[PDB]
């Protein structure tokens, strides 16, 4: 076979240890999921420093806790922009999931609260910037560099999916690079606890699995498709279904044959064909052997999965850090003052937050 007796025994034992870890992780998650925390700070506890990113509902800002001096990233959502039914439900998903998870590559939530106008989530500040801007600046990552990030995503999805959580918005914009060069997944705005299928048409066009575009009930396999898109984009510098307008992107995803750069290794192309697989009975991550079809693939043969989890592997890139509160690794955005209305807005729609 491909493995000798000693290697096969080591791998089997490793796989059983993963099961033991995930069972304990589910016990810890469920305690926090059934007993969430709320209103653990208020706005005047923080000095607001700089906008780090913007979205449709608000912005993420670097803030400084006044009493402790610690820096944090504060996501601010304008309740009156979170108007559509699925926008509201997704915001409650995001907070409840973030407060309950615990994994080395998932951003840690510190506080959450709300006022008359806004919802706030205060998380650990990750100063190395988004993978997105490092990737666009350098062009593409070499295969070993892409593989180091990909392995962290595989482990993070194995963790999330074991808790019945689907992530649904994988992309470089959502992956921050910490001081040791490891990834922090942020932005849980589309994550959801799903025990079988779900039906919301949501995500980012280039990263949508065909079954989402086709209005089919879908499952956690959409995250494995998205991993294929991410690995392709990291290694090529552009994603596999690439067009100016969303409708053109969708047509390529459902009906397009993926083409690969001539510099992709055959091992990489083989992995990507099996992740970017339209047939759900054939997509890696969705078969009887689950995540192990990915972890045991030839492209990952050099990956020490336990060492990645334990953060024992030297990262390919360490961001320059000029001290606490440095924002040099983030792009600049237009600043707009936070206005808190004298009247409560959308109080009933956000009771649970």
């Amino acid at each position: 076979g491909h493995m000798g007796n000693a290697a096969a025994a080591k791998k089997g034992s490793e796989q059983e240890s993963v099961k033991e870890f995930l069972a304990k992780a589910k016990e810890e998650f469920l305690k926090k999921w059934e007993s969430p925390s709320q209103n653990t700070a208020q706005l005047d506890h923080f000095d607001r420093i700089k906008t780090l990113g913007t979205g449709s509902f608000g912005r993420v800002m670097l803030v400084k806790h006044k009493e402790t001096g610690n820096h944090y990233a504060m996501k601010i959502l304008d309740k009156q922009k979170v108007v559509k039914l699925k926008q509201i439900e997704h915001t409650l998903n995001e907070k409840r999931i973030l407060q309950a998870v615990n994994f080395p590559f998932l951003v840690k939530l510190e506080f959450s609260f709300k006022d008359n106008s806004n919802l706030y989530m205060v998380m650990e500040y990750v100063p190395g910037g988004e993978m997105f801007s490092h990737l666009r600046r350098i062009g593409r990552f070499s295969e070993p560099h892409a593989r180091f990030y990909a392995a962290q995503i595989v482990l993070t999805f194995e963790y999330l999916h074991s808790l019945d959580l689907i992530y649904r918005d994988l992309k470089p914009e959502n992956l921050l690079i910490d001081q040791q060069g490891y990834i922090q997944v942020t932005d849980f705005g589309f994550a959801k606890r799903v025990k079988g299928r779900t039906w919301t048409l949501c995500g980012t066009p280039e990263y949508l699995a065909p079954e989402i575009i086709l209005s089919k009930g879908y499952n956690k396999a959409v995250d494995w498709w998205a991993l294929g898109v991410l690995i392709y984009e990291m290694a090529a510098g552009y994603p596999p279904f690439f067009a100016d307008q969303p409708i053109q992107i969708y047509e390529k995803i459902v009906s397009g044959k993926v083409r690969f750069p001539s510099h992709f290794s055959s091992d990489l192309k083989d992995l990507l064909r099996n992740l970017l697989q339209v047939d759900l009975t054939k997509r890696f991550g969705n078969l009887k052997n689950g995540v192990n079809d990915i972890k045991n693939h030839k492209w990952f043969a050099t990956t020490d999965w336990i060492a990645i989890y334990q953060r024992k592997v030297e990262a390919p890139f360490i961001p320059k850090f000029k001290g606490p509160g440095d924002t040099s690794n983030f792009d600049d955005y237009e600043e707009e003052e936070i206005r808190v209305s004298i009247n409560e807005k959308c109080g009933k729609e956000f009771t649970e937050f």
Binding site: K84, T200, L201, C202, A243
Partner: peptide, 13 residues
């Protein structure tokens, strides 16, 4: 030709 800047995620439609 395709989108090179940051990409917004869509909640609906």
């Amino acid at each position: 030709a395709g989108r090179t800047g940051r990409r917004q995620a869509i909640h609906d439609i």
